[model samples]
Target: QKVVAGYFADWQYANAENPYTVKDIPADKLTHVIYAFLSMAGPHTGASETVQNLVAKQAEGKDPYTAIIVDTEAALEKNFGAVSVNVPYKGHFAQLAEMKKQHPDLKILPSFGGWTMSEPFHAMAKNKQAMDQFSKSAVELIAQYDFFDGIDLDWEYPGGGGLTTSPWNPDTKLSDEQKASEREAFTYLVKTMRAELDELTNQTKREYELSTAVGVGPKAAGIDWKAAEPYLTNMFAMTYDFLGGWGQQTGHTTNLHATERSWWGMGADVFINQMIELGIPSEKLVIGAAFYGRGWQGTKDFSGGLPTQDLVSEQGAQFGTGENGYFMFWDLVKNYGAKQGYEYKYDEQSQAPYLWNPEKKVFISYEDQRSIKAKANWAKQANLGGIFTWELSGDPKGELVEVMYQEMQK
Candidate 1:
């Protein structure tokens, strides 16, 4: 019944340190840590720093990786055609299942939605029959992989509707009153899934886990909490994206350190409390943490950021080419990325941590040890379920993961 569930880092040759090892880690301190088995829809998926790590772990017979996330895919067949969605990696689903089987202790699940998948839900939610059909398909597909424990819904914003713009999308047609019922339909989806699994009548339910990906802003308020409440076995609140990348004009995409100036996801506090109030237990809620940082370059006032690089006279005018831009954590340490423009440091008041570069007059914001600790403390204070991050490899040494883990155990 531990609150902290470790997230696996995306693997990449650049990330030499396999952070999931339990060597110095207090494994008993976690209920279960998720390893995102990253996948993709088509030609665009990059080699995930997370997936490569998982593959190496599989090759090494690393049995400690408790769970793995199988991500991303091309769109499901619809009225139009296959839409492209990109994740960090691209691989056959069965191949990943075989790898998961090799690690008996680990449970893998395919995360079906993401920012890219948002457009498809409107069509999917059109009818109960269609919804049930989708759930049934999930059950059948998950059955193919004995290594998988359950499914994680990545339906970007189910109640709010996103980009795809389906012609007859009910998500768009439903009155606010009927839209409120969508949450109930969502819960029914889980209940139906649970019932189907229970019908299997095994010693343990096939529906071992249930969950979804959510946003951090007030936009999340549109969720039919009363409906989607029970459908979630675990809810990952995307705590990042609080800052919209225009830090110069707005705040950069991510500032791990929570600040009034950069605060946009203030809804996270409300989301947590309301879900629990709606009857979803605290154990199922996990604050989503980011492993990457947002960066930008343009004009500068010079307050101290990353060290400048070189001067490139694009228009033949040597106009301060070394702006080098501001950045967050992944940019600094990941071998694949260039040196971070700023040093990642922790922030206290915001209960989040961020890295800064004074000279460059730029900033890169992302999560780190200190910011995560603050989240852990909040979860602890609220007596909530636990903390979950985007992917595990985001923290190489398990330093940041360890901080959150220890805080939960304490």
Candidate 2:
């Protein structure tokens, strides 16, 4: 069966108006629910001694570089009614345990590190001892929290496309030599993690999977897939965010096919093909779909209602879920549309969708039912593992997810 996964952000439950808790997850539609992040206890180069000491204090009895859950209140303290699991935890973890009890086949992975929290990984990967400590601690987490099936590593970019200022490099970027060393260290880390997970499986007589959320383009090329493929269960390609408010040029952020019209000519297909060419099996590759849109304000329609337009500023439009051109799928559907003077447009060449408001000069590139369905169908045809979303909170109504689930079924 195809694997259908969704990333559940830990902070969503704290939303002021609509808190999206683990209870709201549509477990039936997903094979796996990966918790957004579990921070590392290792030291960062740029961090102050106080901050470093605090992070180190969190490790305590565990390894100094161990992956730890920082949000105890949201993860294990809050009361979420009653749970059947024998675990002493309550909050989100408890809710997940209950959800898993009802759906025995569902897998829940606690992802470690994200775009902002990935700095620790940079420091930890360089030291073999730190890698060993991190690997052991990761498995220890699953043992402690029995509900968690395995671990998901989301180290943004091993070679240093993540945060600029780090403990290792304050103002300078990672040199080519350092980048290569980090890449090699990453493989060692994965190998050690696999060994630990396999050891646990032997003792518990239960299988555990190890996966990672990967990036596209140069970020994809940073890893040595040939060395790491044997130990990984899945490589989730973050195929979205091809373009966003960070750039002045407007284009598809999650388009399926590549088009010359776009400045970068990037697409999900390009990323997948690159991975396959690098010897990664299609069965172990999963394509990503965004649940939110990237909007640009003060834009010009250069391609006759298509992308590749000019925006006055790269700061993005202030609308939707938050500031700077970020629009949640639910918000886009409920608010921005024909009624709001935004004309909807779809590009057949790229299998992409967008909203153009000429009157307001706003261009929002996002995913919809049509684009998601196309991605699912393409994934099936290409013999890929499955489709996964960056997050679940963006589309609270599950409109895009339903389309993906139904299409993948065919």
Candidate 3:
């Protein structure tokens, strides 16, 4: 119950005809499998018919994804200022039609509002009608699928900011009261959705998981805690992207180390504590981990003999193009990134990892099995529930799942 060892199914594996199956995974370490990002793939890469079956098979002992996370269709379009429609899970419904009975412990839910789809979020929150529309869609979607266990809102943010616009209209000729109303509307949206979603969930008698991906910044810490005091269940805080290649500097994003005072700031523990103080239960928060590392190129020289920097990009960090650039686990091993070629030290203050390759003169900050064990200890020390990693595929060879299991046991 403490660890949610999750995995992803790239579009290819979701197919029924594919040779790759759940049998390929060692079921012991994984608890659930989220079918991440099912969107424009249909148009861009052609949709698949086997995604639901893939999820259902896990419950049948064929695959291990007993708990599946489903992203709503077209939510990204509406968020990005494009047209969208209410997408149905009916296409993949047959496989999960009896999921509640097939796998009583399995979790299947809709996760709306991701990074790209968070555009119109402010609009949705400011207007009552929009909130109602959203609630209706949510209830209808869950009821239609009949197997959904909960609603996971992936709103890229809360209160404000991001690709979404503000209807407050600073330039508009409006009374001061009107301006305050918009700000107030944001909290109302949060409260209203909580109320309605709760009502629907109770009526259905199925466990409804209310969760969202929290941002890692002051803005996140500033969310209206009073509004969320009621029904916000699990907050999958995105602690990884706070720093990365496109971040303030290029280097390791998740499980950071070295230099502070910038974005991805030198304060992961602080961010986690802020949410806990905001009334989010410790068990309800899931820490974010990166399966991949951010990279850069053309640095004048390596500072500590590692591969990258803290953030933003001072001299760039890696050997490839940032756009077409790439970095993988193989590179880490081949380059002796974490080996003697690099400096080794653990931060008792941060309970984190760091490396300075004096020979290469670069800094390495990504989390490997050894570092993750430290961070996981941090999570346990804080009495937090569990840890989350970005894209399981990124660290398949790193034995990440194994180390993660060990940390939780600690």
Candidate 4:
């Protein structure tokens, strides 16, 4: 059967506007919930002698799960909600376990290494010995938690590539020898992880899933698709984020089709087609959906028309201010979307939504009911595995999520 999965970012507790917790999630609607991230770059190195050794030593005193637990509790208290007697275990992971009773189909997977934390994956997957030890630790770590169904590798990249930033950046620069080994290393990492997973299955007599979130960029060769095929249950390509504030001009960040204005021929079709051509099975491909939007300050006309004026930078947070030319879908829906001076606009060819303020010369590109409906229906048409969301916290009211769920049923 096709699946519907969503990522649950534990860090959303910092957002007072939409503070999400396990209790806030609509577990029944989701087939899978990927817990945000754990890091490969951590305190314990060499081999995995102890469970704590596998975890990255970032925050002092608090472990990864407790870090989120404390944040969640603090957010709840700030909102004037009842304080929980139990924490950490009784918070997100524990609540997920309890939800399984009512919704047995739900599976929670812990995703390791995200945009910022992927620097360690190169070292972890460097060689068979390293990969083997890492694999063993991964399975044991999941077992220790006793809640996760398996693990999701969000390596950001395997070969030499990643984001261009400071702490949130990935290690793209590598030695010539290291570059040569990157592809092979990733394959070995998946193989060893699969072997360890199977070994655990032999003992528990239950199926353990292995999945990955892959980048859908031209340099995607960094990911060894053919080698990873046999081991993964599904590969959720980040089909969105094709365009964003990182660029000067504005365009549909998650357009279903390539518009004439597109500079790089980017769109969901381009990404899915590339994956299929790379020998990944059609049934194993899961389309990605963004529950947020990318905003450009000085843009007018449809699709962030070029020859546009320079962006106007102002102080204060633009809807909790990442200030990186990005805005959440909910924030847009509330503040902009046909409200205030901004007008909601959709591109028929792209099957995507955007908001434009003629007075302010701003455009917000995001996905909505119409675009999500198109993606879900198109995923079915393309015989895709299913559709997944970028996050659970973005849709606090669950309206967008409901659209995806209902569209999939059709």
lDDT of each: 0.49, 0.83, 0.51, 0.70
Pick the lDDT winner.
2
Is candidate 3 or 4 superior in lDDT? 4
User: Which regions in candidate 4 have their CA more than 4 angstroms from the true location?
Assistant: 43-88, 164-172, 300-323
> In model 1, which runs have C-alpha deviations exceeding 4 angstroms?
6-30, 33-107, 161-184, 201-207, 246-259, 264-271, 274-279, 299-330, 334-345
What TM-score, computed on C-alpha atoms, does each candidate reach? 0.66, 0.93, 0.67, 0.84
Model 3: how far residue 367 lies from native, Å = 2.5
Compared with the true structure, what per-residue lDDT tens digits does model 3 show for residues 245-329? 4433644456533335333344556677777777778887876665544444433444643333332334435543112233443
lDDT of 1 at 206: 45
Total clashing pairs in model 2: 2
Can you tell me which runs of candidate 3 are displaced by over 4 Å? 3-35, 38-103, 159-186, 247-252, 256-265, 305-365
List, residue by residue over 281-307, the lDDT tens digit for candidate 2: 899999899898998877753433556
Off by over 4 Å in 2: 44-57, 60-62, 165-170, 301-304, 309-314
**CA error at residue 231 for candidate 4, angstroms:** 0.6
Lowest summed lDDT across 10 adjacent residues in model 3 is found at: 38-47
Q: What order do candidates take by lDDT, descending?
A: 2, 4, 3, 1
